[PDB]
Amino acid sequence: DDGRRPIRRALISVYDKTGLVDLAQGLSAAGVEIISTGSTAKTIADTGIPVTPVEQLTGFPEVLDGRVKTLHPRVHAGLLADLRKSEHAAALEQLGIEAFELVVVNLYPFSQTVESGASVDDCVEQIDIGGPAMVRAAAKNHPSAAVVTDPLGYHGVLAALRAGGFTLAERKRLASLAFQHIAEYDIAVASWMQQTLAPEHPVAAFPQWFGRSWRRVAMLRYGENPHQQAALYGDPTAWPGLAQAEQLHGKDMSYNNFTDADAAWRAAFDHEQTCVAIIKHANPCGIAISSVSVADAHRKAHECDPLSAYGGVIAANTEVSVEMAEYVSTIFTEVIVAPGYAPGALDVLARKKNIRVLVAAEPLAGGSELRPISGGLLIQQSDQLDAHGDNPANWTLATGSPADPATLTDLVFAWRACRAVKSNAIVIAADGATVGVGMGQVNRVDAARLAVERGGERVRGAVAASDAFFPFPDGLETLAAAGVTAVVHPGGSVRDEEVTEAAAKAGVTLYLTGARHFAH
Amino acid sequence: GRRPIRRALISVYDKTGLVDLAQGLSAAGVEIISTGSTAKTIADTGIPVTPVEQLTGFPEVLDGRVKTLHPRVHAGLLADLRKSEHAAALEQLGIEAFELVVVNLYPFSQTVESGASVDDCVEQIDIGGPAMVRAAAKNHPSAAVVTDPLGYHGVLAALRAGGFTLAERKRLASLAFQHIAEYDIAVASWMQQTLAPEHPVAAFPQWFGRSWRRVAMLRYGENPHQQAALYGDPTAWPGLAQAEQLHGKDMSYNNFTDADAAWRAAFDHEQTCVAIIKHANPCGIAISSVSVADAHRKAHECDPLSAYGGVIAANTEVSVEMAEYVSTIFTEVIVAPGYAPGALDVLARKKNIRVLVAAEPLAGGSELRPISGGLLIQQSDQLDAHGDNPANWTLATGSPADPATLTDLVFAWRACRAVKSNAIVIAADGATVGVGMGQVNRVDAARLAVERGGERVRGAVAASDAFFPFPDGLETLAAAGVTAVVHPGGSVRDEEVTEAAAKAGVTLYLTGARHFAH
Ligand SMILES: O=CNc1c(C(=O)O)ncn1[C@@H]1O[C@H](COP(=O)(O)O)[C@@H](O)[C@H]1O
Ligand SMILES: [K+]
């Protein structure tokens, strides 16, 4: 047996009356008795459909401006009696109470009331008490009761009605969806109460309690490596990002595709000029800006390390042109992400069957960054390159002639690009493009040597940025000996003088920012 | 906005401090309305109790499922006494208000953790309890709701002061909704996983929810211009977020990520292991069949310059001998499952070193990786793939590895997980000697490992966390004198890489398992 229980009596109390009339018409036609609260009963009764008011059942009126209407045992006994138990079924009979097979409830629009910029009191008034009590009761008692919390499931109710009720398995599923809905509502209420109702004094950057939930977008083929299973989740209350990106072409997105596309997208939007960033398994192949075109930024970004760009992930901070798309079609690329594509650009990209072509919403300023650790979570403000020392007008010229406008643009480019590179990081750049990148080293002099080696013949006359201060002169000397003309670093070492003297001996322009951009 | 307490509604799972709370309330002339074991615990002391059935006048049915879901309870909780109409509605109905509500639930995460059956878990779902807490929290301008015995001292103080202030009632309301949120996340999670899983069952559920409690505000995040905080998951198995600090200054944000990385790297080996990290990067990792002090010396010797200001993790108790050597090296953090008698005193000679005690990690587990607008969740790389067992390795070329070479290969293979990709680990005698880390190009990682390894590379073994895309990466190792190399294989150019190892007389193993990490 499927555990089907024919629907005879339904309890309906909905804030949102979308699809209610069609649902009620279907239920009344099947001979289902509808029990409803005030305005739900009005909406149904105005159609000519008979309604049993909740007060008729309880003998107690709706009081305190709709605060205590259904918090009565003559409602909850019909919801909570476990009809698998002879004792519970007899108790309903002793009380003259009948069971509810269907419970249709949707909550006060608390999160919408909050988003509309409503007052503290109107938000508090939109906290539903009876609604969640009815949903939780019916969900707990799923072996007997079917609970529907979304008008999206109303046609499924009418189908179950035609089939002689919901199955036990269908009632288990409804109960799980219902408690998901309740946890989401509670998360919104508890978060708002902490932030607005009772904030700390003095106000702290991060609250004492933090809660979030996500909905699965897709199961992935695997995680970072084939032996690990993985899934993608979307935060429905968040501003759209990579998790909500629209896929226009290509095969399924892998786990590594999402982390690379996320890293590439953030690196491209770290620059105000037209920017293309190329990432391969979390590491930058090349990054470039352009005052000509997006195609020019892509060519220059690709030219940094063309070998590593094959199989890479491309992000553009502006619309991808047909010209860029033509060149991208000749290079093995796993993913391309952009805020848009020019007419005809997608067709050129769609020539290669596998490339994942994504459209993502431009990121927002600020925002928190979640970093799990064993047993907990670290939360910090996203490094948005907006520190006092990130503004070049606040930089200190420690030695050398001031940077000309083209040198300063390259220095600022290399400085901002250094954030995306894992520490210890050295970015050598020229004409708005990275030419040599020293990445992820425990030792800064190893990062400097890597940037010089990978930069090759393009290092002489270029500029360099260091994401943290040079602890010793050797890292800077490595750059100066290779022909780097201008270097920007945070400074802040007791040995800064020794590093500045080494730049002075080489005739290198040296800027001290007073801001650092460690990234792991 | 102080409101004198006259009537209290009490129903609690955790009976800690209940008798003292009730004695204080009865002495002030507060009427106590209670039910169940809470009512008996209070009544057995001689304190008078108004049972909920006397208030409601409704018979006990359905094993108590609806006893508090009554307007004689909820009208008293929900009447907005700021409204003259609600105060008069209460008088025309004959129902008195509640100024205090003391309710705490059986943590459902503990109901599921206690190993209760599906039927018992379903039976444990509290309806009335959360309804009472929610009602009083919503009606905080009139009602004070206490959901933790830790706030009972504050209740008695408020009682002496003529009630709680409006501001404290707002704070209690916020704390009450957090305790409801946490309860409902645990029921909803247990329902995705156990009550109503997908058919066929998926490795990760359709909905995922979690909450955390702030442990501390940090001085800053990764860099000074970023504000940050540390959170602990109270329903999780203890980790770095719950580590006990025995000595030193405040833990920084970077101290926690480094200590977390070090702890995981040390527990990636079954033998006594010490891992040293700096900037999420490994300075040195070593195993030992002698002592923890021997593993630390060998780990330190990999890159002693970078170990200065580093973070140390040991997968076993730190001895006095290890502590003596650690006291001569500038160290930011030391994390261990314990410290031998006298070891802490030796470490405490240096005022700043943060000395931590952490619980040993558990097998399996999910790894959370946020992305813009969402979250990636995957199984933690626990080095338990088919290809991680050396009996499942394929000898592509060369003579089989002797027992000492195979131990070094397995050590280098497992150590490669902790190194950010593209990673090359050169090792000898259970210790890393040269590490090529975080490169976009594998040949750059091979060159780095060889350069940093120096004179210790000739005769050593090497592991590659992903396949060699070209022979050059392997040739870099072979030309430096590496005798045996282990990598996943899986490239169309594997034969060319194997031919390059053959030409060099290098033993080459193909695992069929990869360990990318970022
Ligand atoms: O907090 C109060 N919420 C309660 C209560 C109670 O406190 O007893 N009963 C029903 N609700 C909710 O009232 C809304 C439906 O009511 P109407 O029929 O009046 O539209 C729906 O949103 C129901 O959820
Ligand atoms: K960086």
Ligand SMILES: [K+]
């Ligand atoms: K790795």
